Write a protein that binds this ligand. Structure first.
Ligand SMILES: *[C@H]1O[C@H](CO[C@@H]2O[C@@H](C)[C@@H](O)[C@@H](O)[C@@H]2O)[C@@H](O)[C@H](O)[C@H]1NC(C)=O
Ligand SMILES: C/C(=C/C=C/[C@@H](C)C(=O)O)[C@H]1CN[C@H](C(=O)O)[C@H]1CC(=O)O
Length: 261
């Protein structure tokens, strides 16, 4: 068969990540806190877990440039965590980094540790097309993110209809981060095209916000890895193993469940 316990026991790895609730946070505390110890969140538990199985040591580092990884339109150069990996500056990228076609062409991904899809976040119409087929209520996504790239690329009529809308209204309707989008829903009359996984989080934390419709597509977040990295195939197996016993479900339950609505 294929055995993995301690399979990369000798290695010490550099993990790049980005701050995003509730995947990666700085711990709230009162003594000065140091190293890996600074951080917490779903991705942080996932790391601990993957490290226990695969037996490596690791250092967490926030992406220096502070972006996920888009390709520059003008000169076709990669930027965020995606960049960090190519220049081999990091071994692993553990974050809500969507496994994208474009991204997969320059980097290797593990199999998903979470599956999701694009959805609508509105103030408490119920279709992606209920939206595209109209003009009253404005809608948008995070600029140059996986969500946007979906519509930009889509040959399905509905989503290419919607992409035309947002493209024409680029600077008024595309936001620069999740929080900006959330706030823009609460403040204006705006439907935010957001990843279901993150909607589900804010939904049970703010009682005025709801999800409209189901999943427009389906993504996964994968552990990121330089092109052809040896470690990858192992990380995939180590993932499914956690998924198997239902640790992932429990980690999910831990950070997401809470207050209510
Ligand atoms: C495989 O995993 C375990 C391996 O433990 C030790 O460390 C690894 C890196 C190898 O070098 C190996 O020689 C050592 O024994 C085993 O303890 C375990 O029985 C194996 N699991 C299965 C079910 O195949
Ligand atoms: C929260 C988020 C922000 C992305 C911001 C872009 C502008 C970037 O900094 O590269 C990511 C996380 N998952 C999606 C992705 O992998 O691209 C994206 C969220 C989204 O597009 O809805």
């Amino acid at each position: 068969p294929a055995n993995i316990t301690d399979s990369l026991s000798n290695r010490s790895l550099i993990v790049t990540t980005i701050l995003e609730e509730p995947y990666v946070l700085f711990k709230k505390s009162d003594k000065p806190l140091y190293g890996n110890d600074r951080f917490e969140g779903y991705c942080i538990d996932l790391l601990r877990e993957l490290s226990t199985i695969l037996g490596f040591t690791y250092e967490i580092r926030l992406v220096e440039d502070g972006k996920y990884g888009a390709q520059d339109d003008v000169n076709g150069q990669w930027n965020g965590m995606v960049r960090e990996l190519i220049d081999h500056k990091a071994d692993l990228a553990v974050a809500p980094l969507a496994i994208t076609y474009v991204r997969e062409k320059v980097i290797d991904f593990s199999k998903p540790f979470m599956t999701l899809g694009i959805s609508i976040l509105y103030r408490k119409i119920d279709s992606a097309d209920d939206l595209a087929k109209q003009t009253k209520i404005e809608y948008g996504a995070v600029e140059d993110g996986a969500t946007m790239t979906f519509f930009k690329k889509s040959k399905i009529s509905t989503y290419d209809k919607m992409w035309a809308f947002m493209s024409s209204r680029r600077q008024s309707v595309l936001v620069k981060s999740n929080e900006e989008g959330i706030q823009r829903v609460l403040t204006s009359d705006y439907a935010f095209l957001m990843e279901s996984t993150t909607i589900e989080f804010v939904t049970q934390r703010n009682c005025n916000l709801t999800q409209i419709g189901g999943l427009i597509d389906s993504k996964g977040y994968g552990v990121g890895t330089p092109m052809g990295s040896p470690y990858r195939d192992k990380i995939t197996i180590a993932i499914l193993q956690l998924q198997e016993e239902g640790k992932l479900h429990m980690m999910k339950e831990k950070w997401w469940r809470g207050n209510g609505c």
